[PDB]
Design a protein around this ligand. Sequence first.
Ligand code: HEM
Ligand code: HEM
Ligand SMILES: Cc1cc(N)nc(CCCCCCCc2cc(C)cc(N)n2)c1
Ligand SMILES: Cc1cc(N)nc(CCCCCCCc2cc(C)cc(N)n2)c1
Ligand SMILES: C[C@H](O)[C@H](O)[C@H]1CNc2nc(N)[nH]c(=O)c2N1
Ligand SMILES: C[C@H](O)[C@H](O)[C@H]1CNc2nc(N)[nH]c(=O)c2N1
Ligand SMILES: [Zn+2]
Lengths: 403, 405
Amino acid sequence: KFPRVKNWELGSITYDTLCAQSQQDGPCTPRRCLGSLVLPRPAEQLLSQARDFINQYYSSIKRSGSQAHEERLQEVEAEVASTGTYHLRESELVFGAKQAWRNAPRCVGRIQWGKLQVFDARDCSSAQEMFTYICNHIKYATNRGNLRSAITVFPQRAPGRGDFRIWNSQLVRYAGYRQQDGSVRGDPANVEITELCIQHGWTPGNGRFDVLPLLLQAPDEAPELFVLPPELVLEVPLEHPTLEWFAALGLRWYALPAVSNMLLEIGGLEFSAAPFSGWYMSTEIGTRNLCDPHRYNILEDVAVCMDLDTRTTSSLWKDKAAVEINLAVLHSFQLAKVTIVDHHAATVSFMKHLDNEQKARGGCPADWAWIVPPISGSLTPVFHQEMVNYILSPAFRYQPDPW
Amino acid sequence: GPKFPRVKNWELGSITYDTLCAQSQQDGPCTPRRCLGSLVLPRPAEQLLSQARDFINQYYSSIKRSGSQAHEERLQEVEAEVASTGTYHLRESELVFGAKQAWRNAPRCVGRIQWGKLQVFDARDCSSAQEMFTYICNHIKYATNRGNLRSAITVFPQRAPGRGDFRIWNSQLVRYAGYRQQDGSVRGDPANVEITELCIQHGWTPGNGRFDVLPLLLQAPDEAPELFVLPPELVLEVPLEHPTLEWFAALGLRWYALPAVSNMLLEIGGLEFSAAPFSGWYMSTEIGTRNLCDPHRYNILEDVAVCMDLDTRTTSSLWKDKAAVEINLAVLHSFQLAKVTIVDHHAATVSFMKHLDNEQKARGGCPADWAWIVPPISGSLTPVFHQEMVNYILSPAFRYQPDPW
Ligand code: HEM
Ligand code: HEM
Ligand SMILES: Cc1cc(N)nc(CCCCCCCc2cc(C)cc(N)n2)c1
Ligand SMILES: Cc1cc(N)nc(CCCCCCCc2cc(C)cc(N)n2)c1
Ligand SMILES: C[C@H](O)[C@H](O)[C@H]1CNc2nc(N)[nH]c(=O)c2N1
Ligand SMILES: C[C@H](O)[C@H](O)[C@H]1CNc2nc(N)[nH]c(=O)c2N1
Ligand SMILES: [Zn+2]
């Protein structure tokens, strides 16, 4: 029943009892494990999720069983029975957004989970208003380089109508221009959204790092285009501490990682637009975004500049170039005084987080493949830590693209 | 599409469906409620016969004589034997097939493109610890082949009805001693502190170096294990140096040529071969990243970083990553110089991708454990990081077995 969880570096063992609180099945069965897959393939039920969430909330404020708790359960029940749905109080929304983050198995930054600014944007009625709230978020979160975690929550999905959606996958994305000869200029991850923006009327540039406009959608309307004011998108030019030519690569990344296409589920209610942001771990930029062969793919270029023997894998040219690029990212963010965390510091804080959650809740859902960094895995303590992965609610969830 | 798991490569965009998993007859540790894929060790008569029939069907399929008269006579032969003895025995060619298939089936092995090239030594006539030692030395000589390594397994008698097992007590044929110190630190390999102490309890005179090769504790049915020293000339080792950092050689680090697992159970058609040591060649990260840099192994990162004059006082200098790369390069360079077979993690993962394609066509899938397949440095720089994998247990199989003591 309750899995034993061992750390193989220290020999310490815990038991996950928190997983018993899971109500949603993942993709694994006793016949086969699907844990490396990136994606998975009525009133009575809303009422149970609603009730369980309100119980979660009153328990957190230590008022479990109180008058307030009972009356609030009655409101929820009365509202659902009459209308087939309900609405959260602001404080409940705040609690549920933090819990969704806390519950996120793929997030290595969860030590921070209790520190989240929640902007309530549920009184939004147009793409125009969405834009204003998004700019306020960016400005707040960016804070001239001293980044602060934030979420803005737009109106929940409703039975009658279409969703509020932000089409872009992040608030900040560089264009990817598909070229005649089949290559890509810019970020190949963003080809499709770049073509959408143009098709909806954007005048495209032709750089490797052109910031995309937002396509914002109010219910049952065509999305609208909105150019972010350049002054709101903080960027960091990349340079290397000792390698002078590196700056000459013209590389850069944006300060603010802000995910904008995930669904936030709290107590059975769904928030189809609820962008959220923290600060980056350097390997996201230095390893994945710049070195993935299907991303900016700069490994070779960097290795030649370093004059490495590129002819053979056993010279470890890829490994050496990747280290330097990661170093350049850390250096430059430090130089520009913009919050960043390296993969060693981040995984150490995650280990402290596991221990906190063990005491607090008796476990912590974690996806080992996503937690362990993409370079130097076993040099970080999380590589040696067993982890149990399961879905708790409140949750952030993947949702299909709106087009 | 199909009612089998969809498997995607996020680098290339390509998709397959694993149909092979339908052949799995044994449950792993995961359920719909929670994934336990990251756990290292998760916790007959009519049963034997059904496993035997399945294995014999597998054998006859592989030789394309499925449904044939020889196929039906063999099945009858197996149940007759089980009917009268409670057990049965494999033909030589059945053993060779099952051993290769146990390797092909191993989800944690990245080297499986080589699975068809395994020399299977049949040692099922062995009846003493002394003879086990001879067989093991022959295995070591054949497999080592003066640095031109050749994959091999040697198979000792199977488990039998309430008669004791053949066991090799050591986890590998080559292991460096780990000596517990008066201050609680370890000299040598901390992985091997228990077996080192077991060797001394059984009469071994200990050394005091960081790289003392252990003797073997070999157990024949119903006897106490006996101790055997490997002739030093049989254990090929590689002194580590670095191609440009001249001081690395002065560190006195080394590793042995032959990775030879000796404590796993080989299961074929319900038969259990408790002693069946097998060996291949190393992927360089196993030595240079894990064995040398794990904090709970030789733990050399800080020493190397100090020699490289790195800033070890702050995580963000990436001193750990820089030192680990150089140590891996030293491992590769030293083995190449010594002419001892080794494969780096780029070339190994690339060959594992080819393996996956071959197996897609041949069997409809390939059981693979993503956390074990992805190397412990430079993970996402290798093509396997971007490749989804389905993990499931097929038989024949290599299985972990409890330590004999
Ligand atoms: C405070 C700084 C934070 C750091 C350093 C951090 C770290 C990370 C990293 C490295 C990833 C993997 C990203 C990738 O591989 O593409 C990630 C994923 C994720 N994080 Fe965080 N995180 C932070 C804050 C947040 C916040 C504020 C939230 C939401 C309130 C959040 C929720 C998530 C979710 C839901 C994922 C998985 C996304 C997916 O499945 O696509 N994180 N985190
Ligand atoms: C030919 C060269 C080979 C290479 C490069 C190779 C590579 C590897 C690596 C890197 C591991 C993970 C070890 C660790 O992290 O400690 C492994 C595990 C494994 N390999 Fe191979 N392998 C090779 C040959 C073999 C052979 C000949 C067999 C058996 C016939 C084999 C069966 C296994 C098994 C059963 C495991 C899992 C061990 C466990 O769970 O403890 N491999 N392999
Ligand atoms: C198909 C698919 C599914 C899925 N769940 N996720 C993805 C892409 C994941 C992109 C997330 C990248 C943003 C990560 C992030 C978010 C935050 C808030 C902080 C931080 N340091 N990093 C694709
Ligand atoms: C507790 C535990 C369980 C388990 N299944 N496995 C382990 C790890 C044992 C380490 C296995 C070392 C395999 C080394 C090897 C073996 C072969 C044949 C080739 C090659 N390159 N490497 C521990
Ligand atoms: C196939 C595999 O699951 C996939 O490549 C995962 C591996 N681990 C990851 N880990 C993080 N943090 N982010 C990722 O995108 C991925 N990709
Ligand atoms: C907890 C975790 O499963 C454990 O540290 C695993 C991770 N991946 C591994 N991968 C390989 N090849 N070898 C290992 O010993 C491990 N250890
Ligand atoms: Zn699983």
